[PDB]
């Protein structure tokens, strides 16, 4: 009663030696709670009547207020540390003592005398004491508690301002007051848009107040969003904790994740998808730094688990909803979302190495924000969004420096596909300005990763590899957008993740099926080997670069007639790792074999689709030049080609684009064409050379 | 472009909507969204007949939508509900669409199946074959439902039963699109702004000022033309009822509760009067066709009785005091219809050629009273049971004016009691109506 004036919330057993006090009255306190619970539940106060209305709440908070009391007498023991004796009454004291509030509540809402404004007034008491008693017991820090060493007045706390002394009965309580919230928050979405200002609701079942009024009481006796987080914060990592203790009160984290995924589901709905201006603003007030840090943690800590076990993995789910519905909701700042960025490590301006791997949470979060940023700028015509053409230069260079170290990288500190996808996504959505500008950059770190052939021959190529793959994509697909990747990234990271153990790479045929054989026999935990141009359809060799690729590649901003050569010479790229290794008398592993085959593939596709360069075909028009093992490769292959016509003209056309003058081109070809034997003896001659 | 829509729509309705072509309609309506909410009345009937239809083939659906392709379909029935809600708001003559069906439809959009008739399916396939209108494609689509999970995620929370999970979904968002245009309000403007309860309404408020009870169907020429009256009544009550199984009064606050009781206390009255008008024609005196409609009309008088009772009681914004005081209101109107339909003879009828309670009482019970007489009797006495085993414990242990005919009306049980006994000799109707009961069995 005198806490329910000024909502002065304050408990007793503060002290521990207090709360050994009280510990020391629990069996009785026991026994009154039961008669009370037995007497209320025979038939009793059949009519709530004003008078017999507030007595029965009375009894209903009594409990309420005593139950609370002894989990934070038990938090103060538990900071300074029959004793199961005690612990089994106190239990049964704070149940019981629910209990009865549950039973007067029922009454209350069914009863035909006051059952419903005095059932919200009701939920309200509850919920109020239940939150002060939650946040008071999870302010209990050993160090406040020797410093006492007796009224626990949240306001205090508050005013002054490890959360330790959350445990079983934290979460019991928790729970119920979740349910309590959201009641009342519902009652607030029903209610049309902006209804109303008015005083915090007075805390009385009589008292006729506005729900609104009611919640804005509940935040103004303590704040809502920080002490949900708090709750959340502190159960998912106790849950963690009782995970841990597994591998090596109850010890079910499941408990916990319950108690934290209700939490988010609460955020999410009552208040994210909330569209009360109040709630909405008061979310916005309330969000900070501090919180993104903590959501940021929790991602992490999710998505690094590497345990789906079943409870978690609806708590994941659950997180990311809520990571999802902040990077929609104009609630989180640009500032909130750029700071959670930073604090996952995907800061799409931080410096350092881009991630290559990026966690399930961390990546689906990231590309959220980062497409629904492009689409802004595009709902307005606003220019190629920085950060995203950041993240596109600091991936291209994490990658040219990995390429130059050509050092295989782990599952860990691989690109995933994922990631590659939205990536590939980003790059779509930027205007010819921005895209352009990515493929130049690609054509001139391939030409200086050439510069040094002998590094190349003797790295493993898994990142040039990779690089290669993007740029092939790109040439394929360079204006219009595919329907696949679309649906590929909605399906990956735009979609809940609930615990669909696949994410969707078109894989390598031919690697896959090699890497599965010399592989985990289980499933294929990872995706190394994909591809994300599609099995596509053997279209005819010529008309693959996209038009629009063709002409970027022989405009002034990209050297092809000398990204012919980088390309040719890199084929040599991871030739020599098989002499190294064997002279060695190491093998090379199967993780290295494969790349060796992918990167193979993946030039020998791009030679193939890329038009002969100028002098190139003037070297096919000499062969005075040794025209070494991959040369000679080449060379074949693009004699073989011209000895197509379809290919002459491809050829030749592009030879028209290159800017070579057409005369010299008609020469060239049909020197290089050597109709009828003339053909004949020269492959005869360079083979024999 | 628009004859490639109509063309899913006809492939469909030979044999079931093919999902396949599902992901096309969607984006047609999500698209000519601004024509159909903004459009000429040339191609009125062409719009409204679209509508319908896909309305029609996205609830036959529902429980099988590609769970990626679900929130475009969400999307296109907020467009549809929105059209649905402005034409019931504002009834158009060039519509080709009926109130009641417009009901349903978004009753259905809103509910787990639809319900317009196939022979209307194929009226509306006619409206619409009248052709009065004003790859690449695949990208565009995909590119949209993109444009889509990205902007908004379902919050898909609250192989079988996946079928129930997803008509789950769609009833759930398409009943937030509703809320979302408080059409649940303006289909309470719609409620109370029925042709034939526009008049109904205003007797029964009329009533409320302790007029007496005052039943107009009554005079023999005035049970003729109500019997005349009697099949386009039937029309109203059943879209009434229709409308009100939606959401519609989901915040009963006393604003809002007070039409709420209004509505419900309209049927209550307008079946009691079709009751003292079959008790007209009874005692007085295509007739059995009437009959079945005045059997309907009073059957679904009581069934929207019931229901707002309920929705009063369940509701966490009234309930209690306002919730009982419903039911006094209940409770009188029914009394005072059994009064009225017990003491009418061929004798007052034939002289007559609106009866009042008091005029009775100030004057002072055999036949009239019929079947349906026995419906309204039945639910008379449930309510005053109700009120009784209040006054019991409201007196525990043995423990004012009239309670005022009107909800929030503040009484004590004793109170709302007398009111009900000063309405009609109460002793006096119960017995007369055992009798009556008793010998009509006999």
């Not at chain 2, 414990?393 to 009691?417: C, D, F, N, W, Y």
Request: proline share 4%; glycine share 4%.
């Amino acid at each position: 009663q005198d806490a329910v004036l000024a909502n002065s919330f304050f408990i007793m057993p503060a002290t521990v030696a207090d709360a050994t006090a009280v510990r020391n009255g629990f069996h009785s306190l026991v026994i009154d709670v039961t008669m009370a619970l037995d007497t209320l539940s025979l038939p009793v106060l059949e009519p709530l009547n004003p008078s017999r209305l507030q007595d029965v709440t009375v009894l209903s908070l009594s409990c309420l207020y005593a139950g609370v009391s002894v989990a934070t007498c038990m938090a103060i023991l538990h900071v300074g540390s029959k004793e199961d004796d005690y612990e089994s009454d106190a239990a049964t004291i704070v149940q019981k003592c629910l209990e009865i509030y549950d039973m007067i509540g029922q009454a209350i809402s069914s009863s035909r005398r006051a059952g419903g404004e005095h059932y919200q007034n009701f939920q309200l008491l509850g919920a109020w004491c239940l939150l002060n008693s939650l946040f008071l017991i999870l302010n209990l820090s050993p160090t406040a508690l020797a410093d006492k060493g007796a009224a626990l007045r949240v306001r205090d706390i508050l005013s002054r301002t490890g959360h330790q002394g959350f445990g079983v009965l934290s979460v019991i309580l928790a729970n119920h007051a979740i349910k309590l919230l959201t009641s009342l928050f519902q009652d607030l979405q029903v209610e049309a848009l902006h209804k109303g200002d008015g005083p915090p609701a007075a805390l009385s079942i009589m008292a006729q107040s506005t729900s609104i009024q009611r919640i804005q009481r509940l935040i103004d006796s303590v704040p809502l969003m920080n002490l949900l987080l708090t709750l959340l914060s502190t159960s998912y990592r106790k849950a963690c904790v009782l995970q841990r203790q597994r591998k090596g009160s109850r010890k079910d984290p499941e408990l916990f994740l319950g108690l934290a995924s209700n939490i988010l589901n609460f955020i999410t709905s009552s208040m994210l998808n909330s569209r009360n201006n109040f709630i909405r603003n008061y979310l916005s007030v309330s969000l900070s730094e501090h919180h993104m840090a903590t959501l940021a943690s929790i991602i992490k800590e999710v998505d690094k688990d590497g345990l789906k076990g079943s409870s978690d993995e609806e708590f994941a789910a659950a997180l990311y909803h809520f990571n999802h519905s902040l990077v929609t909701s104009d609630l989180q700042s640009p500032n909130l979302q750029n700071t959670l960025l930073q604090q996952l490590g995907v800061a799409p301006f931080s410096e350092g190495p881009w991630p290559l791997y990026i966690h399930p949470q961390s990546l689906s979060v990231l590309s959220r924000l980062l497409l629904i940023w492009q689409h802004k700028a595009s709902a307005q015509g606003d220019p190629d969004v920085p950060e995203c053409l950041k993240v596109w230069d600091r991936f291209l260079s994490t990658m040219k420096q990995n390429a130059l170290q050509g050092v295989v990288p782990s599952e860990t500190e691989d690109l995933n596909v994922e990631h590659l996808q939205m990536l590939l996504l980003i790059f779509h959505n930027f205007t010819e300005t921005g895209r352009r500008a990515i493929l130049s950059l690609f054509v001139q770190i391939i030409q200086e990763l050439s510069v040094n052939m002998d590094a190349q021959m003797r790295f493993v190529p898994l990142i040039l590899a990779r690089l290669l793959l993007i740029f092939d994509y790109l040439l394929h697909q360079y204006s219009k957008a595919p329907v696949y990747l679309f649906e590929q990234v909605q399906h990956n990271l735009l979609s809940p993740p609930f615990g669909a153990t696949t994410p969707l790479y078109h894989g390598f045929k031919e690697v896959e099926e090699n890497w599965s054989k010399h592989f985990s026999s289980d499933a294929v935990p990872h995706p190394r080997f994909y591809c994300v141009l599609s099995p596509e359809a053997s279209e005819d060799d010529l008309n693959r670069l996209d038009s629009v690729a063709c002409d970027v590649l022989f405009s002034k901003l990209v050297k092809y007639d000398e990204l012919y050569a980088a390309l040719t010479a890199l084929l040599a790229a991871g030739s020599q790792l098989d002499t190294v290794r064997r002279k060695e008398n190491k093998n090379v592993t199967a993780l290295e074999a494969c790349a060796l085959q992918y990167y193979f593939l993946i030039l020998w596709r791009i030679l193939g689709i890329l038009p002969p360069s100028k002098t190139y075909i003037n070297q096919l028009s000499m062969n005075s030049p040794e025209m070494s093992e991959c040369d000679i490769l080449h060379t074949l292959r693009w004699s073989s080609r011209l000895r197509i016509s379809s290919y002459v003209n491809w050829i030749k056309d592009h030879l028209i684009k290159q800017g070579m003058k057409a005369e010299h081109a008609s020469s060239l070809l049909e020197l290089a064409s050597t109709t009828k034997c003339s053909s004949v003896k020269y492959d005869v001659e360079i083979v024999e050379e | 472009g628009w004859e490639v829509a109509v063309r899913p729509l006809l492939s469909a309705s030979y044999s079931a909507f093919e999902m396949k072509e599902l992901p096309q309609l969607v984006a047609s309506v999500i698209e000519s969204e601004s024509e159909i909410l903004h459009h000429e009345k040339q191609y009125e009937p062409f719009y409204s007949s679209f509508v319908a239809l896909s309305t029609h083939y996205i609830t036959t659906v529902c429980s099988l939508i590609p769970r990626n392709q679900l929130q475009s379909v969400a999307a296109a029935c907020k467009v549809l509900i929105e059209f649905s809600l402005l034409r019931l708001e504002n009834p158009d003559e060039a519509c080709a669409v009926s109130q009641k069906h417009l009901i349903l439809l978004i009753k259905g959009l809103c509910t787990g199946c639809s319900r317009l008739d196939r022979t209307e399916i194929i009226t509306f396939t006619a409206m619409m074959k009248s052709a009065k209108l004003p790859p690449e494609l695949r990208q565009k689509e995909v590119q949209m439902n993109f444009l889509n999970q990205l902007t908004s995620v379902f919050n898909p929370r609250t192989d079988q039963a996946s079928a129930i999970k997803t008509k789950n979904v769609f009833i759930a968002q398409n009943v937030a699109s509703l809320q979302e245009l408080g059409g649940s309000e303006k289909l309470l403007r719609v409620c109370l702004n029925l042709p034939y309860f526009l008049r109904y309404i205003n007797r029964f408020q009329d009533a409320v000022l302790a007029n007496s009870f005052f039943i107009m169907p009554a005079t023999v020429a005035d049970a003729t033309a109500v019997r005349n009256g009697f099949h386009s009544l039937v029309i109203d009550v059943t879209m009434a009822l229709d409308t009100l199984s939606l959401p519609v009064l989901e915040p009963l606050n006393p604003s809002r509760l007070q039409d709420v009781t209004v509505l419900s206390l309209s049927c209550l009255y307008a079946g009691v009067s079709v009751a003292t008008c079959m008790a007209i024609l009874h005692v007085g005196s295509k007739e059995d066709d009437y009959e079945s409609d005045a059997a309907t009309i009073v059957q679904k008088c009581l069934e929207i009785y019931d229901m707002i009772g309920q929705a009063i009681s369940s509701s966490r914004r009234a309930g209690g005091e306002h919730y009982q005081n419903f039911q006094l209101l209940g409770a009188w109107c029914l009394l005072n219809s059994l009064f009225l339909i017990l003491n009418l003879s061929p004798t007052a009828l034939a002289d007559k050629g609106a009866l009042r309670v008091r005029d009775i009482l100030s004057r002072t019970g055999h036949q009239g009273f019929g079947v349906l007489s026995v419906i309204l009797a039945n639910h008379a006495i449930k309510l005053l049971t109700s009120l009784f085993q209040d006054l019991q414990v409201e007196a525990l242990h043995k423990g004012g004016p009239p309670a005022a005919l009107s909800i929030m009306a503040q009484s004590t049980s004793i109170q709302r009691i007398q009111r009900l006994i000063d309405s009609v000799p109460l002793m006096n109707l119960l017995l007369t109506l055992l009798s009556t009961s008793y010998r009509k069995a006999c």
